[PDB]
């Protein structure tokens, strides 16, 4: 039973960014990559996505010599001013949860506010990540952030985050 991992860990990213999916390397032979069900021409344990296009969005799976395939990993490509990024959208109670109010082309974001279910959780003048050290079921809900890029105010698309047991 293998498992795909992302680096950076963000499943949600901007059009043009880069991400690398890694097939749980442990225990050499070959690595099969499935993008949207189709077999990709990649054979390494690490599939490199560069200059991400919307097309790159979708389900990804890897297969080693362990018969069974890996659990699906969904990647989504956006193109907005701010994008709320999460270390994971389904967290297990007890583990950390990381949220990042990511700005277009890495441009500066000021007056960053993170909201949960409509409520403003934290404010930061300089952009800053929000980190939930010990995830609680209470921490579930729909999050989003707002900030200022190029002196203008922008809001990010909401993201559902669920913390199970």
């Amino acid at each position: 039973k293998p498992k795909v991992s992302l680096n950076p860990p963000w499943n949600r990213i901007f059009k043009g960014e880069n991400v690398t999916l890694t097939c749980n390397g442990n225990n050499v032979s070959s690595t099969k990559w499935f993008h949207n069900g189709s077999l990709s021409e990649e054979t390494n344990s690490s599939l490199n996505i560069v200059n991400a296009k919307f097309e790159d969005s979708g389900e990804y799976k890897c297969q080693h010599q362990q018969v069974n395939e890996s659990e699906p990993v969904y990647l989504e490509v956006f193109s907005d001013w701010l994008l709320l990024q999460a270390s994971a959208e389904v967290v297990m109670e007890g583990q950390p949860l990381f949220l990042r109010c990511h700005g277009w082309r890495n441009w500066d974001v000021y007056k960053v506010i993170y909201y949960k279910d409509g409520e403003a959780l934290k404010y930061w003048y300089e952009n800053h990540n929000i980190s939930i050290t010990n995830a609680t079921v209470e921490d579930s809900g729909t999050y989003y952030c707002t900030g200022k890029v190029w002196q203008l105010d922008y809001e990010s698309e909401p993201l559902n985050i669920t913390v199970i047991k």
Binding site: S79, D80, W81, W104, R105, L152, Y154
Partner: peptide
């Protein structure tokens, strides 16, 4: 969605899609 001038002034479009069309 309001975008800065440069998104339209410049040659190449540097801003998110939400700014165009």
């Amino acid at each position: 969605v309001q975008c800065p001038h440069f998104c339209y002034e410049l040659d190449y479009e540097l801003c998110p899609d939400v700014c165009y069309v």
